[PDB]
Enzyme design. Structure first.
Site, PDB file in Angstrom:
ATOM      1  N   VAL A 193       2.551   4.062   2.048  1.00 61.50           N
ATOM      2  CA  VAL A 193       1.848   5.054   2.909  1.00 61.50           C
ATOM      3  C   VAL A 193       0.842   4.302   3.787  1.00 61.50           C
ATOM      4  CG1 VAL A 193       0.219   5.649   1.010  1.00 61.50           C
ATOM      5  CG2 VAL A 193       0.475   7.169   2.926  1.00 61.50           C
ATOM      6  N   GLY A 221      -5.266   5.162   5.263  1.00 61.86           N
ATOM      7  CA  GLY A 221      -6.123   6.067   6.054  1.00 61.86           C
ATOM      8  C   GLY A 221      -7.209   5.285   6.791  1.00 61.86           C
ATOM      9  N   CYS A 222      -7.798   4.283   6.139  1.00 63.92           N
ATOM     10  CA  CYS A 222      -8.842   3.418   6.744  1.00 63.92           C
ATOM     11  C   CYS A 222      -8.352   2.749   8.049  1.00 63.92           C
ATOM     12  CB  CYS A 222      -9.330   2.387   5.738  1.00 63.92           C
ATOM     13  SG  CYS A 222      -8.116   1.093   5.403  1.00 63.92           S
ATOM     14  N   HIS A 249       0.852  -1.216   0.000  1.00 69.02           N
ATOM     15  CA  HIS A 249       0.000   0.000   0.000  1.00 69.02           C
ATOM     16  C   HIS A 249       0.869   1.240   0.000  1.00 69.02           C
ATOM     17  CE1 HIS A 249      -2.797   3.097   1.418  1.00 69.02           C
ATOM     18  NE2 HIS A 249      -3.784   2.306   0.985  1.00 69.02           N
ATOM     19  N   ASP A 271      -9.732   3.306  11.658  1.00 72.03           N
ATOM     20  CA  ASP A 271     -10.162   2.124  12.442  1.00 72.03           C
ATOM     21  C   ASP A 271      -9.633   2.205  13.876  1.00 72.03           C
ATOM     22  OD1 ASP A 271     -11.857  -0.125  12.041  1.00 72.03           O
ATOM     23  OD2 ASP A 271     -10.215  -1.303  12.890  1.00 72.03           O
TER      24      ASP A 271
HETATM   25  C1  LIG Z   1      -6.966   2.812  -6.755  1.00 71.02           C
HETATM   26  C2  LIG Z   1      -6.466   4.164  -6.368  1.00 71.02           C
HETATM   27  O1  LIG Z   1      -6.160   5.055  -7.175  1.00 71.02           O
HETATM   28  N1  LIG Z   1      -6.334   4.349  -5.033  1.00 71.02           N
HETATM   29  C3  LIG Z   1      -5.913   5.576  -4.518  1.00 71.02           C
HETATM   30  C4  LIG Z   1      -7.105   6.071  -3.676  1.00 71.02           C
HETATM   31  C5  LIG Z   1      -6.907   5.685  -2.270  1.00 71.02           C
HETATM   32  C6  LIG Z   1      -7.852   4.987  -1.600  1.00 71.02           C
HETATM   33  C7  LIG Z   1      -7.686   4.706  -0.208  1.00 71.02           C
HETATM   34  C8  LIG Z   1      -6.524   5.167   0.479  1.00 71.02           C
HETATM   35  S1  LIG Z   1      -6.306   5.046   2.158  1.00 71.02           S
HETATM   36  N2  LIG Z   1      -6.419   3.418   2.376  1.00 71.02           N
HETATM   37  O2  LIG Z   1      -4.957   5.615   2.486  1.00 71.02           O
HETATM   38  O3  LIG Z   1      -7.503   5.476   2.884  1.00 71.02           O
HETATM   39  C9  LIG Z   1      -5.540   5.854  -0.265  1.00 71.02           C
HETATM   40  C10 LIG Z   1      -5.732   6.101  -1.604  1.00 71.02           C
END
Ligand SMILES: CC(=O)NCCc1ccc(S(N)(=O)=O)cc1
Lengths: 168, 170
Positions: A75, A78-79, A69, A83
Site C-alpha cells: 500500500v 500515506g506519509c 510497505h 509529502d
Molecule cells: C507498525 C504498524 O502496525 N504499522 C501500521 C500503522 C501504519 C503507519 C503508517 C502508515 S502510512 N505510511 O501508510 O502513513 C500505515 C500504517
C-alpha cells in the site's frame, strides 16, 4: 509565473536546482519525488482565489515502496502522499519568484480514509492556496485522490522558504 | 506485554509478519522503516497513564533520503519522521495483542521546527498514548515528539492509527 504546466523532465530539472536557480526551491529527486507532472498551476482562482495546483503520480505494481510497505500487504505510504502536497506548496512559492530553500513547517488536520494499491492507475493532488505571508510562507488545503476517489485531506499545510536554512 | 524493548533484528522480524503473526500489525521493511530500536514500550504510566514508546533511528550521511532530498541540500524528510510516529502507534496496538493490519488514520496539528542533517548521530521518538478505543474498530490516539541529539524538532498532536481485521473499507 510563466509556465502553467510542467512535465516529468521539467520536475527533474527542478530537483537539480536548474528550474528556479541555485539557492531557490527544489523538488526532491527519485526516490523521494512523489509527482510525475503538474497538469495546472496558477496564482489566481482556486477555492480561495489565491491559486491552485493539480498534479499526478502514475502508479504501477513495481514502484519501490510497494515491496517494503508492507510485505504481503502492499500500500502506498500515506506519509509520501502527504509529502507530495508539501512538495507542491514549496514548488508554488518558488514558481512565484521568491528566493530560498523550501522546508515543510507542518499542518493542521490530516485525514487518511482510503489507500493507493499497486492495481491503481493514477494519484491526483489538488492543492488550494489559502494565504501567502510576505519570512516567506504559504498556507494551503489539499486532497489526494486515486482514479477519481478522494482518499486523503490536509488542512493548513505550511511550507516556508529559507535564504539561510542553518538557522533551523 | 512481556518484552519492553526490541532490537533492529526484532523490528525486521515484525516487518516479515513473524513477531505478531500473519494478518496482524506489521512494521515496514527497509527502505520505508524509520526505526532501528524500541528502547522502551509500556501500556501503563506515561504522560496520560496509557503508556509510552521511546525509539531511536541512527543517522549517517549515506541514508538513502539525504542524496535525493535535496541535491546539494541534504535534510531528512519531515514526512518520514512523522511516519515513524504512526508506525510506532501501530506497533503499540499489535504489542497489546489486538488482531488485524494497521493503517494510519491521520493527525491533528503537526509542527516541524528543526531538521535532521547528515552530520547528526541519533533521532529519538517519544510517543505518549492518550486513548485506545476498543469498540467496532481498534484505535489509538497519541501525542509524539521527534528529537535529534537531545533537541526537540517535531511535535504531532492526535496521531490516529487503526487495526483492520479487513482493510477492505480503504
Ligand atoms: C507498525 C504498524 O502496525 N504499522 C501500521 C500503522 C501504519 C503507519 C503508517 C502508515 S502510512 N505510511 O501508510 O502513513 C500505515 C500504517
Amino acid at each position: 509565473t510563466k509556465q502553467h504546466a510542467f512535465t516529468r523532465e521539467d520536475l527533474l530539472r527542478c530537483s537539480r536546482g536548474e528550474l528556479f536557480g541555485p539557492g531557490n526551491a527544489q523538488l526532491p529527486a527519485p526516490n523521494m519525488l512523489m509527482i510525475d507532472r503538474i497538469v495546472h498551476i496558477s496564482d489566481v482562482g482556486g477555492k480561495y482565489g489565491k491559486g491552485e495546483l493539480v498534479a499526478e503520480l502514475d502508479i504501477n505494481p513495481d514502484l519501490w515502496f510497494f515491496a517494503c510497505h508492507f510485505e504481503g500487504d502492499p500500500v502506498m505510504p500515506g506519509c509520501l502522499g502527504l509529502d507530495a502536497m508539501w512538495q507542491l506548496v514549496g514548488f508554488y512559492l518558488g514558481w512565484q519568484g521568491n528566493p530560498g530553500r523550501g522546508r515543510a513547517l507542518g499542518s493542521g488536520e490530516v485525514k487518511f480514509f482510503g489507500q493507493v494499491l499497486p492495481t491503481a492507475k493514477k494519484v491526483t493532488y489538488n492543492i488550494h492556496i489559502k494565504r501567502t505571508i510576505n519570512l516567506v510562507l504559504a498556507i494551503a488545503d489539499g486532497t489526494v485522490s486515486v482514479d477519481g476517489r478522494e482518499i486523503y485531506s490536509a488542512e493548513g499545510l505550511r511550507v516556508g522558504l529559507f535564504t539561510s536554512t542553518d538557522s533551523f
